Design a protein around this ligand. Structure first.
Ligand SMILES: Clc1ccc2c(c1)CCc1cccnc1C2=C1CCNCC1
Length: 263
C-alpha cells in the first residue's frame, strides 16, 4: 500500500528500455554507413540488453507485487537472467578484446577484424553463456545437496567462486585493456578519442552501478544476517537502470546515431 507507485515506476522503465533497445537494433539493420564491421559487436550487447529487459522486467515486478508460477517458470527466469547478464559482460569483453587488438600497433593487424569472425565470437559467447546456464537447471543431479531463489544459495563457496570469476576476470582484464587503450591514446599525438570516451563511459556506468551490488553480495557471501531485502533491490535495479541507460549512453560519445534516431 506504500510501495506500489514505485512498482509502477519500475514498470514504466520497461517501455523506455525495450524501445531504446529495439531502436538500436533497427538502427543497425537500416543504415549501411552505420552498419559498421565492428558495430555488430555492440549489437550483441543491445540484443542481450533487450533480452534482459523483457525476461527480467515483468517477472521481477511480478515478484514485488506478489509476496513470496511454479518451479519451471521461475527457474527459466533465473537461467535467462543469468545468460543475459553473462552475454552482456562478454559482449563488452569481446568489444574490449577487439579495441585492444585494433589499437595495438596495427602492422600485421586489421586483417582479423572481419564480420564472419564477429558472428563466430558472438556465437562463442552465447554458447559459453548457455554452458554457464546449464548449472542453473542442473545443480541437483550433479551434486547431492514458497520462494524460488538461486538453487545453490545454500552453497557459499560456489557462490563466491562464480562471483569472483565473473566479476574480477572480466572487470580486471577490462581495466587492463582500458588502461592500455588510454596509454595508446595519450602517446598517439578525434573519432578514436570519441571511441575512447564511449568505452570510458560504459566502464564508468557499470563500475558505478554494479559496485554496490557486488560489495553487498560479497558481504552476504560469508554472513547471512547482514543484508535484508531492501539493500539488494536498490542495487539490482540500479544495475538494470544502467542496462537501460547504455542505449542512451551510445549516442553521447558516438553521435553518428543522429539521423537514425530521429527518422
Ligand atoms: Cl556483471 C554481473 C553482475 C551480476 C550478476 C552477473 C553478472 C551474473 C552472474 C551472477 C553469479 C552469481 C550471483 N549473481 C550473479 C548476477 C546476477 C544475478 C541474477 N540476475 C542478474 C544478476
Amino acid at each position: 500500500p506504500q510501495l506500489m507507485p514505485l512498482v509502477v515506476v519500475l514498470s514504466t522503465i520497461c517501455l523506455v528500455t525495450v524501445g531504446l533497445n529495439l531502436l538500436v537494433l533497427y538502427a543497425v539493420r537500416s543504415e549501411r554507413k552505420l552498419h559498421t564491421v565492428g558495430n555488430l559487436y555492440i549489437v550483441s550487447l543491445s540484443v542481450a540488453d533487450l533480452i534482459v529487459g523483457a525476461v527480467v522486467m515483468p517477472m521481477n515486478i511480478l515478484y514485488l507485487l506478489m509476496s513470496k508460477l511454479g518451479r519451471p517458470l521461475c527457474l527459466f527466469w533465473l537461467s535467462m537472467d543469468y545468460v543475459a547478464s553473462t552475454a552482456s559482460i562478454f559482449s563488452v569483453f569481446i568489444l574490449c578484446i577487439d579495441r585492444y587488438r585494433s589499437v595495438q600497433q596495427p602492422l600485421r593487424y586489421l586483417k582479423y577484424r572481419t564480420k564472419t569472425r564477429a558472428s563466430a565470437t558472438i556465437l562463442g559467447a552465447w554458447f559459453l553463456s548457455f554452458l554457464w546456464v546449464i548449472p542453473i537447471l542442473g545443480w541437483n543431479h550433479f551434486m547431492q545437496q514458497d520462494k524460488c531463489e538461486t538453487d545453490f544459495y545454500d552453497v557459499t563457496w560456489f557462490k563466491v567462486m562464480t562471483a569472483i570469476i565473473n566479476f574480477y576476470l572480466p572487470t580486471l582484464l577490462m581495466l587492463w585493456f582500458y588502461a592500455k587503450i588510454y596509454k595508446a591514446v595519450k602517446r598517439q599525438l578525434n573519432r578514436e578519442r570519441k571511441a575512447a570516451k564511449q568505452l570510458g563511459f560504459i566502464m564508468a556506468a557499470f563500475i558505478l552501478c554494479w559496485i554496490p551490488y557486488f560489495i553487498f553480495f560479497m558481504v552476504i557471501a560469508f554472513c547471512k544476517n547482514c543484508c535484508n531485502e531492501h539493500l539488494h533491490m536498490f542495487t539490482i535495479w540500479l544495475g538494470y537502470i544502467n542496462s537501460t541507460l547504455n542505449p542512451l549512453i551510445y549516442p553521447l560519445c558516438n553521435e553518428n546515431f543522429k539521423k537514425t534516431f530521429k527518422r
